[PDB]
Write a protein that binds this ligand. Sequence first.
Ligand SMILES: Oc1ccc(Cl)cc1Cl
Ligand SMILES: Oc1ccc(Cl)cc1Cl
Lengths: 169, 169
Amino acid sequence: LEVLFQGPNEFETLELEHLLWVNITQVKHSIERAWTRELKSLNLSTEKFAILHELMCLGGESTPHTLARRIVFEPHSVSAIVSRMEKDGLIIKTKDLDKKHMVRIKLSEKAIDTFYQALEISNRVYKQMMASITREEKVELSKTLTKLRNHTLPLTHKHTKTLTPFKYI
Amino acid sequence: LEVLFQGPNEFETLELEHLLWVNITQVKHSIERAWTRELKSLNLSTEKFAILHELMCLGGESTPHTLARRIVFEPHSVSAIVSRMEKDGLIIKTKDLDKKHMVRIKLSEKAIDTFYQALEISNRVYKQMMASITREEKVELSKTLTKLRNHTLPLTHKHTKTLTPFKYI
Ligand SMILES: Oc1ccc(Cl)cc1Cl
Ligand SMILES: Oc1ccc(Cl)cc1Cl
């Protein structure tokens, strides 16, 4: 005999758009926790891997402002992450010879070799994580998420980002 | 005349599963930045709103271990967020009368009234953010993201979570 007055209340039924935000949050946390443990032996968080990857796309050297433009994160966050990486020996900062006050940021050989290793592990980890959804589901998920990013990024980022135009296939 | 040797390199073409992780990350950051600015006048981060919401589903009072079980975040994070909320006057912690060392956590009247306000603003914000995708796209996005959460959460959370079974419609 089911007990009375103990079933879910009205706050467990959400607008679909709110449930989508819960879903996005839960998958981002679930996948990050699993990937971060597999990458532990290289001491990479997801943000340090993202910054290594963007600098690889830039030919291994750039400036803080160009890297910030290319990546979704806030610039103060980009700067904090780069400073952590500098202390890990992954990034070398040098004074630009021309512009007083401008910094150039360059990946070390150690960091490029770490990225070698981390990209191969990372690709295996994302594939095994997403093996439960089909190619077509993956294709439509990227299209829908891309529509959402294109609609929402300009609400707070007004010409400040020119995100790296990643391709697949 | 297009300059030579300056086009994207091979690190800009990703495995689809890696591009999906970039997409998830970018939408989570884009939507959070926009929602957090609209909710500023109530001094809520997304995590404090999530904890207020889960405690509302629990009838406004619970214990740290039950709240942790119901929410995706790590328990040390849940605890840090609850302590911040206690300092904001949103949560009252009391010693359980029976169990030595057990804490009960209860929302204050101020917090329930804040949640009133925040839920109504939040629902408007998520709707306007997601107005670019159709009902059917929203429905399929929740189904795909739910498959991904169900496959990936058990890789690191082994019977430690019993996430709140949110419904829509
Ligand atoms: O590889 C990446 C580049 C950028 C971002 Cl935001 C995430 C990842 Cl994994
Ligand atoms: O309302 C919520 C409940 C849980 C989580 Cl993880 C996110 C939100 Cl918005």
